[PDB]
Amino acid sequence: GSVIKQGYLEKKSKDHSFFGSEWQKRWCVVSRGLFYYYANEKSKQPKGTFLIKGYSVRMAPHLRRDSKKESCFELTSQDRRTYEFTATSPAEARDWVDQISFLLKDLS
């Protein structure tokens, strides 16, 4: 079907409120051409959706300074906002990068 990969990641998330950005747990889904994410796997509505065409993806240890930096990756665009993620492990992050890359290369 349409889902390529899904699971929990920490997303760097602006609260648009008093505290700014924090790493926050999100259930993330990448389907063909489309990424969407929720607070929880059983949340009623997504927090966000975006078309992935135009994005680049890579591991990104600059995103944090603690020991989870080896599990961080980013989706970047020169036109739209970047999305920054921490997986549970380097292996998990590498898989996200690989699976999203496979989509992005086809889209290109």
From Swiss-Prot:
It comes from the Eukaryota. GO terms for biological process: adaptive immune response; positive regulation of adaptive immune response; positive regulation of cell-cell adhesion mediated by integrin; positive regulation of cell-matrix adhesion; positive regulation of DNA-templated transcription; positive regulation of heterotypic cell-cell adhesion; positive regulation of integrin activation; positive regulation of leukocyte cell-cell adhesion. The modification Phosphotyrosine is found at residue 37. Phosphorylated on tyrosines. Residues 2-105 form the PH domain. GO terms for cellular component: cell-cell junction; cytoplasm; cytosol; immunological synapse; nucleoplasm; plasma membrane; plasma membrane raft; T cell receptor complex. GO terms for molecular function: protein kinase binding; protein phosphatase binding; SH2 domain binding; SH3 domain binding. It is found in: Cytoplasm; Nucleus; Cell membrane. Highly expressed in thymocytes and peripheral blood lymphocytes. Also expressed in spleen cells and testis. Present in T-cells (at protein level). Keywords: Adaptive immunity, Cell membrane, Cytoplasm, Immunity, Membrane, Nucleus, Phosphoprotein, SH3 domain. Disulfide bonds: none annotated. Belongs to the SKAP family. The SH3 domain interacts with FYB1. Positively regulates T-cell receptor signaling by enhancing the MAP kinase pathway. Required for optimal conjugation between T-cells and antigen-presenting cells by promoting the clustering of integrin ITGAL on the surface of T-cells. May be involved in high affinity immunoglobulin epsilon receptor signaling in mast cells. Homodimer. Interacts with FYN. Interacts with PTPRC. Interacts with FYB1, which is required for SKAP2 protein stability. Part of a complex consisting of SKAP1, FYB1 and CLNK. Interacts with RASGRP1. Interacts with FYB2. This is Src kinase-associated phosphoprotein 1. It comes from Homo sapiens (Human). The gene is SKAP1. The chain holds residues 106 to 213 of 359 of the full protein.
